Design a binder for this molecule. Structure first.
Ligand SMILES: Nc1nc2c(ncn2[C@@H]2O[C@H](COP(=O)(O)OP(=O)(O)OP(=O)(O)O)[C@@H](O)[C@H]2O)c(=O)[nH]1
Ligand SMILES: Nc1nc2c(ncn2[C@@H]2O[C@H](COP(=O)(O)OP(=O)(O)OP(=O)(O)O)[C@@H](O)[C@H]2O)c(=O)[nH]1
Ligand SMILES: Nc1nc2c(ncn2[C@@H]2O[C@H](COP(=O)(O)OP(=O)(O)O)[C@@H](O)[C@H]2O)c(=O)[nH]1
Lengths: 430, 33, 431, 48, 202, 430
């Protein structure tokens, strides 16, 4: 009744999807074979007559390697073989390749399977699109899929958990290019874009989990925990139930402004567990700490416009009220003048499940803080000069031109990003 | 029913044990502390 | 034989209604399976006020459960007393209102309102005589506020003379749960002023204060708040259900409480709320009950009565007590706090006495205050509404549901005019 | 009271504490403490 | 205070209750003598002080002061605390029971060694710190009990049989105690763990 | 309700804290793991969710070895891991090093944890700072922390149990230097400073305990017993209850004169136990004996100003009154003319608990006599020339200058100590 369709595009999408679906299987008791030894799985799994549960997910990639890793991993009998969709040639970090030449047929088949999945859902809260802003498969094909979904499904809430390039550390060279292009694409299609940075999650793993050598599995485990906390109210009952549709109403003041910073608390390993109180107030303060943010963007630079809190576990509304009142009275945290409330609290009685073999410890309380704030303009400012420094010399432009783009597309993407910058400046200013 | 009862019973046991156990003594939470 | 039709709206309204119906079933000796198990004829004297008899001994509440999402009333049905309600009175949509008053009042409420009115009419026609409808819901939520106000308007249109009683959980001052609380509260207060004959204002933070200071609970869930609210909702109508030395119905309370039609918002308090530690140490006497009643901390509304002036105040006592003691106590209260009482009303107290106290209590009393202190509550909500409306924050969510911008201005103008009424009668001098 | 008692007693305390040279105080306390040290080191025990 | 029922009837007559003989007898029978007219005036006064109609306690929430939020039916018993709908699940690919010469057991050993090597080596000298934390005693040699306790300190759900397999695989030199050299040799980053993880067909 | 924050700075501070916290755990029944099998622990311990009791103490040191000894020892599961704060470089017996260059970040972290600890206390009687006057960590860092606490906390009563250099025997060479500096620092920052001398405690162990080979563990055990006897009235009820705040009001005739001799009685081994009466009068006389004083300073040289007695065990107000009357009538003990009473007697019904493996015997009566007396200016006269003798040659002055000190600072400290000598002479005078 509360079904949500999961889309995982690109290597980052599929790799965070592995952790996400491991976490969901652990949460709902679904074994890797597919079946479990009610109806809390309906949001993420559809049960068949045989008792086997298949996720309502779609793994899209133009590279066969990542999807075949899923086909060969522990989760073979869980996922639907046709739901795993693989391309033949990788997009090669080319937004043009993934959006104009290779991505056409792949996204058409993706729409076909997405339609088949949506026809299996009585209700449909929305889509959870997990892609990689900064790579051709994630950026181009994901943008095309988002555009098609907006065209056909229409008003369904598409929540994009995008992974942007980190400020100084990065793994690609044309990452600013395809990041800017995909940003122009998803400014107008996705409903709530949850922003993520590898540098920020690396710093979280280094400081909170004491991991000086973090890896993508750790990052994906953290992201999966964040998404599970976000969706917990759909599957488990709780006081102050929060809905997918309630996210945007309590978080999006203006349609252009829908990018969201995410922060999870507590992040404590097994060794450091049960040594501090980890009370509601302390975990709220940790969630509001800039260091625990999952985007390399200091919130002190900007002002919070809205803050939606997802509490999981033994959280009592009086304690959440006291903690949020302390946050409001705190001078360091600054809110916009036009949002006196600026808070959307929601509690859930289900404590976060712990992944066996992961670094996170078993905590009875958890907070997922998702905030709309004008500070996020800083990261777009970084990408806007990382882009123009290259685009002044037209470096790597011919690669994008060869697969069916024009200089006008780059110019329009840069202009739209500048417009978004000015919109953030205006909403921040009185 | 099980989930709601678990939540309420956890809260009641935490109340008993308090009477995280210093949070009821916080200055902001209550002025008498 | 003066029936009351209960309506629960939204998640908060449904939870409060479940708690209230469980309390009433306890008080009337109704087990979760519906059979009477009280061993007291007083319980079955006036059970028709809230229940209808089934083929057997089963008693079904005259309750109507409302929601745009089924999860809340799935939890309600899974609760201990979820099986008493007739399954036909559960009216649900499929997509809940995203804390959107516009969605709950215009787009998604429109389809469900036909079924809601059908159920309400079916329950009301079975009534021999209808005292009225009591609606429990929360201001500051989409389905609750929007659907509740729409249903209240429809029932007002259908049954003008019948009483309308409202228990609205107004958003708390200091901590706000949802961002759009000022919008929803501002839009709902405008409807309640015009439609609701009688309204009780409840604040979650005030309930936290009272349950932490009087009951001295350190981790109070929403169950405790719903318990206190349910106690108030039971005590307000105990005079209809039990014989009283000086009985007083809802219409009598409304007549003695409301001087002018628009000034029907009340703050309520319930006594005696005793901490478990001091239960034996406390003395159940009428002066003690009155002292606890008139304490500002006992109010379940955030606004404290000291800032305003009591226009009127009803006190429904329960127990075998001296009417002389009761009347003398509240006359003494009036004389002592004459500064806090309106001058141009010679007597600001409506005393009612019921002979049957709540189970376990030797004596009890519910207090219903019509005071100009609620002016500051409305003023704060308007301070938030204006700040958000000046920059149209989250306004597109309401605009895309087919609500004009001018509706917000009209609601705020009405609410400010109500504030003006309260202030003008607060500072109004006789002659 | 101040002028007759406290002012007089503090004025007589001064010009005596002030008159006492710091070096003389240090030397006096040093002779005393070294006498105590010597008797502690020589004798097995010290008794009041 | 010990008053006979006849004395209670006389007391009511003196107090001018106005009741008939039968009514006074019923009011006296409201209380019951303990041994022989052993009801005392305080007990009788308590009986008539709060009449308490409606029958008092019942299966519901009740008044705020007297009874808690929860139902009396759903109460008077602490059941449903620490209620887990789904039991804890082991790491996939880890065999609870030891099997001899099976690809499943080989994969379990490879996965477990890889998991431990990833949990360790997270920062520099973390292998050394964990080694020092394994043994409570002053000797560097790691006992079997020390090994099980350290693995339990790590948030890893692994059976005693597989832990003993790890203990034997880490070369004890047939001595039964793990040295720092062999500890490092098997819990190095990559190396034997990575090789065993990759070599599935072996 | 009666919480007191304990700070232990330097090797000596941490090593006496080991004994103090062992003593408190043994007294309250708290097992070393953290938990015990009403609410008398609240003065020193706060109980957590598991029921574990954590001490309200902070182990501060710039050297990692001393703190790691605690991290590895039996009290590893009791103290909070972040409460144990370790530096990287030792102060190397340099007050400048411990107060100016290295100590800054460490003391900032110390104030952070101290604020966290104080926010866990409803009330706060004050601070118990245990350091070693005569070392860079003890002197410099302790002085800096006292300054910061005086600045921010304000009215909290700070009791400094300082260990001063012995007259003739010593283990450091710059000990007079940093001792004078720290004395100048704490003359204005501590509220009640208690003098302790290792030579005097060694003499006590040699004669009363018959230990020909006393060591630091023995010294710290006596110090811990003294401090526990001091605080016993906070945790246990008894006739004539004594308070931390009223130590001042009954003990400090003038704010400058707040240095205090301490003497414990009885100090007897098991073999010599149950061999004498050990009555109240006898133990009071022993406490006023010069040998029982834990500072190498003859009380007969000066005149007592105030004497606070803390009795533990079966002591009756008649016995304490008669003992104090005999002491007053005694001709050797000389009090000032301006303080006719000069006595603050306080009894506790809890006898002193005996640490297993120690040398102190199980005595049903105990006295901790803390006296403000003008005789203590005599040890200050010792340090004042031990200072100036080296200061004439400016020996080891370059070591202190290198880390941001000046000749003026040494001069000001020595001048302040001379002013303290003048003050002692004046207050002894009539
Ligand atoms: N957070 C996170 N990011 C990842 C992970 N794996 C890859 N990424 C990011 O994803 C970006 C590239 O993703 P993709 O575009 O999907 O790579 P691909 O599948 O080979 O497709 P193309 O590169 O476009 O040809 C890189 O810049 C990485 O920063 C991961 O496991 N976690
Ligand atoms: N009574 C007593 N004194 C001690 C003990 N341990 C050390 N001391 C004294 O403490 C003084 C030096 O302490 P610290 O300054 O803390 O030594 P540290 O930890 O290396 O720090 P720095 O020397 O300042 O660099 C020495 O002169 C000792 O006399 C002890 O266990 N008992
Ligand atoms: N007393 C009480 N208040 C509640 C409860 N649940 C929610 N609320 C409050 O009701 C307000 C509005 O929420 P609600 O109307 O239930 O949301 P809706 O159902 O989507 O309209 C929130 O600010 C909550 O603080 C409850 O169980 N008891």
């Amino acid at each position: 009744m509360r079904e949500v369709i999961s889309i995982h595009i690109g290597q980052a999408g599929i790799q965070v999807g592995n952790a996400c679906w491991e976490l969901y299987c652990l949460e709902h008791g679904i074994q890797p074979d597919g079946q479990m030894p009610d109806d809390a799985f309906n949001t993420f799994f559809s049960e068949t007559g045989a008792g086997k549960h298949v996720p309502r997910c779609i793994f899209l990639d133009l590279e066969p390697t990542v999807v075949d890793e899923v086909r060969t991993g522990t989760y073979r009998q869980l996922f639907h073989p046709e739901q795993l969709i693989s391309g033949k040639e990788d997009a090669a970090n080319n937004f043009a390749r993934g959006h104009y030449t290779i991505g056409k047929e792949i996204v058409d088949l993706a729409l076909d399977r997405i339609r088949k999945l949506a026809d299996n859902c009585t209700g449909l809260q929305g889509f959870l699109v997990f892609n990689a802003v900064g790579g051709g498969t994630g950026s181009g094909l994901g943008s095309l899929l988002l555009e098609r979904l907006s065209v056909d499904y229409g008003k369904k809430s598409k929540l994009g958990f995008t992974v942007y390039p980190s400020p100084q550390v990065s793994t690609a060279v044309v990452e600013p290019y395809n990041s800017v292009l995909s940003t122009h694409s998803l400014l107008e299609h996705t409903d709530v874009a949850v922003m993520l940075d590898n540098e920020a999650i690396y710093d979280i793993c280094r400081r909170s989990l004491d991991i000086e050598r973090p890896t993508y599995t750790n990052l994906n485990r953290l992201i999966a925990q964040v998404i599970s906390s976000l969706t917990a109210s759909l599957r488990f009952d709780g006081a102050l139930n929060v809905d997918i549709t309630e996210f945007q109403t309590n978080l999006v003041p203006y349609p252009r402004i829908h990018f969201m910073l995410s922060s999870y608390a507590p992040i404590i390993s097994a060794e450091k567990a049960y040594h501090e109180q980890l009370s509601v107030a302390e975990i709220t303060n940790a969630a509001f700490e800039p260091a625990s943010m999952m985007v390399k963007c200091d919130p002190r630079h900007g002002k919070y416009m809205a803050c939606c809190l997802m509490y999981r576990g033994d959280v009592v509304p009086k304690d959440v009220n006291a903690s949020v009142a302390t946050i409001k009275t705190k001078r360091t945290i600054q809110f916009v003048d036009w949002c006196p409330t600026g808070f959307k609290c929601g509690i859930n009685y289900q404590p976060p499940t712990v992944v066996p073999g992961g670094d996170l410890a078993k905590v009875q309380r958890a907070v997922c803080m998702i905030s709309n704030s004008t500070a996020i303009g800083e990261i777009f400012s970084r990408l806007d000069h990382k882009f123009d420094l290259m685009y002044a010399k037209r470096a790597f432009v011919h690669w994008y031109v060869g697969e069916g783009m024009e200089e006008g597309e780059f110019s329009e993407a840069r202009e739209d990003l500048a417009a978004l910058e000015k919109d953030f400046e205006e909403v921040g200013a009185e | 029913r099980a989930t709601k009862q678990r939540y309420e019973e956890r809260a009641e046991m935490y109340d008993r044990t308090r009477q995280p156990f210093h949070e009821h003594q916080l200055e902001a939470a209550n002025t008498p502390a | 034989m003066r029936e009351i039709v209960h309506i629960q709206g939204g998640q908060c309204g449904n939870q409060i209604g479940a708690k209230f119906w469980e309390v009433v079933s306890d008080e009337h000796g109704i087990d979760p399976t519906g059979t009477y198990h009280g061993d007291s004829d007083l319980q079955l004297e006036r059970i028709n006020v809230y229940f209808n008899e089934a083929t057997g001994g089963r008693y079904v509440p005259r309750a109507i459960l409302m929601d745009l999402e089924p999860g809340t009333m799935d939890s309600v049905r899974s609760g201990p007393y979820g099986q008493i309600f007739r399954p036909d009175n559960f009216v649900f949509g499929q997509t809940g209102a995203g804390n959107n008053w516009a969605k709950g009042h215009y787009t998604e409420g429109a389809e469900l309102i036909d079924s809601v009115l059908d159920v309400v009419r079916k329950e009301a026609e079975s009534c021999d005589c209808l005292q009225g409808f009591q609606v429990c819901h929360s201001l500051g939520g989409g389905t609750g506020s929007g659907m509740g106000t729409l249903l209240i308007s429809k029932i007002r249109e259908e049954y003008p003379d019948r009483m309308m009683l409202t228990f609205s959980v107004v958003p708390s001052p200091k901590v706000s749960d949802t961002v759009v609380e000022p919008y929803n509260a501002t839009l709902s207060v405008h409807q309640l002023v015009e439609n609701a004959d009688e309204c009780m204002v409840l604040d979650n933070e005030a309930l936290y204060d009272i349950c932490f200071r009087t009951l001295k609970l350190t981790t109070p869930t929403f169950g405790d708040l719903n318990h206190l609210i349910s106690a108030v909702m039971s005590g307000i109508t105990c005079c209809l259900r039990f014989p009283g030395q000086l009985n007083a119905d809802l219409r009598k309370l409304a007549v003695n409480l409301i001087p002018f039609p628009r000034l029907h918002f009340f703050m309520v308090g319930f006594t005696p709320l005793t901490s478990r530690g001091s239960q034996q140490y406390r003395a159940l006497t009428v002066p003690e009950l009155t002292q606890q009643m008139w304490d500002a901390k006992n109010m379940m509304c955030a606004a404290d009565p000291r800032h305003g002036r009591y226009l009127t105040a009803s006190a429904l006592f329960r127990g075998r007590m001296s009417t002389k003691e009761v009347d003398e106590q509240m006359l003494n209260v009036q004389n002592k706090n004459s500064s806090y009482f309106v001058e141009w009303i010679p007597n600001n107290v409506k005393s009612s006495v019921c002979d049957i106290p709540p189970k376990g209590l030797k004596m009890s009393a519910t207090f219903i205050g019509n005071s100009t202190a609620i002016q500051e509550m409305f003023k704060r909500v308007s301070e938030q509404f204006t700040a958000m409306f000046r920059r149209k924050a989250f306004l597109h969510w309401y605009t895309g549901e087919g609500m004009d911008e001018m509706e917000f201005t009209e609601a705020e103008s009405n609410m400010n005019d109500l504030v003006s009424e309260y202030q003008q009668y607060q500072d109004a001098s006789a002659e | 009271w101040s002028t007759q008692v406290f002012d007089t007693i503090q004025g007589r305390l001064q010009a005596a504490v002030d008159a006492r040279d710091p070096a003389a105080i240090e030397s006096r306390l040093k002779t005393q403490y070294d006498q105590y040290l010597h008797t502690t080191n020589t004798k097995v025990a010290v008794f009041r | 205070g010990l008053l006979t029922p006849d004395q209670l009837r006389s007391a009511l007559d003196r107090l001018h209750t106005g009741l008939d003989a039968a009514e006074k007898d019923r009011i006296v029978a409201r209380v019951a003598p303990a041994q022989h007219g052993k009801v005392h005036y305080m007990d009788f006064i308590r009986s008539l002080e709060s009449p308490q109609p409606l029958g008092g306690p019942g299966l519901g929430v009740g008044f705020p002061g007297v009874t808690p939020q929860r139902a009396a039916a759903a109460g008077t018993a602490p059941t449903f605390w620490n209620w887990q709908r789904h039991k804890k699940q082991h790491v996939p690919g880890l065999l609870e029971e030891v099997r001899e010469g099976t690809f499943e057991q080989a994969q379990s050993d490879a996965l477990l060694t890889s998991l431990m090597s990833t949990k360790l080596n997270q920062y520099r000298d973390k292998l050394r710190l964990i080694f020092r934390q394994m043994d409570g005693n002053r000797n560097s040699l790691i006992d079997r009990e020390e090994f099980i306790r350290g693995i339990a300190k790590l948030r890893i759900n692994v059976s005693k049989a597989q832990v003993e397999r790890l203990f034997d695989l880490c070369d004890v030199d047939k001595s039964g105690e793990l040295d720092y050299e062999e500890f490092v040799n098997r819990f190095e980053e990559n190396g034997l763990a990575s090789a065993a993880r990759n070599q599935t067909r072996a």
